[PDB]
Each structure stands twice: as structure tokens, then as C-alpha cells.
Design a binder for these strands. Sequence first.
DNA 1: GCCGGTTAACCGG
DNA 2: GCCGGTTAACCGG
Lengths: 257, 256
Amino acid sequence: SFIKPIYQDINSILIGQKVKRPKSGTLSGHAAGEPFEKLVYKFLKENLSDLTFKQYEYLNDLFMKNPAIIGHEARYKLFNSPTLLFLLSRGKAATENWSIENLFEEKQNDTADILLVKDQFYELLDVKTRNISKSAQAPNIISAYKLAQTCAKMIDNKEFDLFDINYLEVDWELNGEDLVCVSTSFAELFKSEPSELYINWAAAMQIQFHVRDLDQGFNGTREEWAKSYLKHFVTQAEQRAISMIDKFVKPFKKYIL
Amino acid sequence: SFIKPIYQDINSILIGQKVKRPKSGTLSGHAAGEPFEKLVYKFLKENLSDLTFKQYEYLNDLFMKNPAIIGHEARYKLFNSPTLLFLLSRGKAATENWSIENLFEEKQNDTADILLVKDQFYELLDVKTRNISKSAQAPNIISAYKLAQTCAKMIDNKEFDLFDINYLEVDWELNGEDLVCVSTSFAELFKSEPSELYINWAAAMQIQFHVRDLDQGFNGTREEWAKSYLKHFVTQAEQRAISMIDKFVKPFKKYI
DNA sequence: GCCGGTTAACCGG
DNA sequence: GCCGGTTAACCGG
Ligand code: NA
């Protein structure tokens, strides 16, 4: 984690900072804390200037630093890693259509919010925003299915010391016409017990939890974390399939006749 | 539908409308073309003032004209219909603590953007907005499971002529730092072939379709539409119970 | 004290 | 045409 070292600095520049609210009034999903992410990234881009990238930004740099190679297959080789391609690359069509005149942009799908890279090591930072004027449910963190596939590809290629998936929670509350941050939390996904990750099937097969309450006591290796996750995943998928019937089938049998 | 009769007028007024790019960050989910919904509502209040209501606004006016009521239990009775209570009402604690000095505000999982009410008949209007400059996937229309519960409720309480769930799509495209409505469309859920609605399980069990493409040729009587929907839904759930093994399970067993 | 469903709307390594 | 995952973050008829 290239972030944990200067965490307090982050937490100190964020708490207290007021940012005028979005000219809409919703403050639901994407249209909420969003500007806090911008703040975090801006700080990092100035205090880790060379390690800090926006996912699409990293991709635009990757291809720009290799103008000699065109086509999608040659560009997919620029990742020198399957898992990394899975986690960060754009589609076949898009990858092939990229150019200095047609650069990549933000994409609702992008696995990460900001990218920190140094020494062929990658930190996938996803910043979560939370309105603490409510006591809502744990937000979507990452797709269980995506993580499952990511683990399977760590095992296949044997890439166990290449990337960390970390989370930064930014708590806020409305105050006048502004949103103001009241506190933050940090957590390393691969530092938590995988067998305990809660997967919310209906919620886009996403595992959900508040960064603030996530356990960080895992002791095995990254190879053992992945195995355990795939285990929990299959177990809970088998479980969901059976649980679905008891809730979405039987309760309505008395109508179909 | 109270909108359909005036639809040509709303399409006319919408096409050409512009709204400021909601935020510096790209427009996804709640941060997309939502502002246009405020324009639809505006037009409706302006031409159907006695019928046009925000969902929370309707609940606020309901409890408001019943000052003697008090208490969630007594207040739920005000709905005079179970199926409407299930689709519109708020939490028990939210209902209990309601007061003119503590009104309902919009909630994220409401159900409907706009409520057109008249003569005990309820039209639930949902506005879908879409970035037409690209070809994206059908958007989340409504929860398949929530629909099943409503159908189950309609059938049990035999209330088949109480409400309609309609949809308005308003397409836009980026013009500088403004979003401009370029097209529009409208369809009625209950006029569609229930057995053909696509249920996207992973995507919050949401049926998804582009409004402009929805089929409007159902024949039957609202009850058939419901019986036909529960049928399709259960079948899809069974199916989904299987497919979740061909994926998620069978292909990951190779690992421990 | 637990457990999970719903709004919004996105392309395809 | 058809099919279907993901990001965001929400409380409790
Ligand atoms: Na809407």
C-alpha cells in the first residue's frame, strides 16, 4: 500500500473540508460524495505525483508510451500479465480503436478509482463515500464474481505479489449548502478474512461491507487468501441457488396452478 | 394513463430542452440525465396540476388531510388498498414519526418518479433517461421480485383496475456542457407481453428494456397479465437457480 | 440482532 | 436480434 504511509495526511486534508453540493439535490449513488474522490486523487496526484494515475489515465499512458504498437493483441501484451489485463483493460473493440486522437475516458465499469504503481506493483484504490446522517446498509464493494475470476487468474498464472485492492471510506454530512467530510477509514481487501466476506447476490453479486468495520487479521499468504475466497464463493453460490427457490418459487406456486 | 393523451405535447416540449452537465464527473447512474425528470414533472404539474404528484408529495398530502389519524397502524389504513401500500408506503417507523413538521422527502428506492392520481385510479410514472450518443444495455426498469409481489397482491385482493405502471424515456446527447433532449418514447408495462419481459437477475433482479422498443400488444384481462407474469417469473427463477451452477460453481471447483 | 432488496443506467478482454 | 454483468450507495409495511 503506497497509501497507508501518508494516510494521516489524507485524513487531515479531508476532514473539515466543505465542498458545495451537486446542483441536482439527489445525493444518491454516483451523484453523491463523488467530489470527495476527486479531492483524494488531487492530493495524491501532488504528493505521490509519479505513482498516481486514474485507471483510464494509466491506460492512455501505457499506450502512448508504446506508439509503435497498434492492434488489440499487441496492446494486450503491454500488460505483461493476464490478471492485470482482466482487472484494468478496455474491451477488444475499444482497445483496437484507441489513438492519440481517440483517448480512453472514464468508464462506469472501471474496477478502480485511482491507480498507484511503483516497482511493477499496483494498488487498486476504490474510494467509498458514506452519508453518516443515515445508518444505511453496507455499500457494494466489489463484484464477488469479478473477485472470484481475479483469484482464479492469480492461481493460473501464479501472480501473487502484483497488486493490492484497497478501500478508503469518506464519511460526510450535508451542512448548509455544502457537503463536509467528517471522517475517513482505510482497509486492505486481502488483509481481511475471505471466508467472512458477505456476498449480496441480488445487489449485482457484490460483496458489501463498511470499510470502517472490516476485519484485517488475515495471516496466510495471498495464495491462501485466494483459495479460501474461491471456496467461500462457490459455497455461497450453491447456497444462493437453493435459497432462491425457497424465496422466489414456492411463495408463488399457489397462482400458476 | 393520464399522460398518454397529452404525450404528443410533452414530446414536443421536451425535444430541444437542455440541462447543465450535472457534475464534472461523468454522468453515470444517479448522476446522469436525472435533471430531465424535473422537466417532465414540471410540464405535468403545469398541465395536470390536480393529478401530478411526487411519490413522497402524495404521501405528505395524504397524511396531511387526516389530522385525527396519528400512529402508523391507523395511517396505513388510509391507503385503502394493500397493493398500493406495498408499492408506495414508507417504513413503519417513518410512518409513525411523520408529522407536518417532519415531512417525507424523496427516498432512493421509491418506485415511481411521478404519481398521477384521479378518481381512485393511480398511474405510476417512471422516467428512464438515456445517453443516445452510445449504444448501451437496457436500463433497470423495475424489480422483477417487487412486481411478483404486486401481482400476487393484485390477484389475492382482486384489485385489477386500480393502477397502471407506465414509462417515459427521454433520450439526450451532450451539446458542449449541456445535455439536450433529442428524442422521447412511452410504453405501458401492462400492455406488454409479460412472458417476454427480460429478468436480469444479477442486476438486482431487474426487468430491463429500452422503453422505445417495448411491445404493446397484450390482449387479456389484467388478471391474465398477472398470472402470466408470475408464471414467467417462477420459470426464470428456476432456470436462474440452475445456470448459477454452470457458472460460479462448476467452473471454480478445480480449485480446492 | 441479522440479513438483503432497489433506485439509476451503463457495452462487450 | 438475443444475452447479461458492474459501478454507486442506499435502512427496514
Ligand atoms: Na427514474
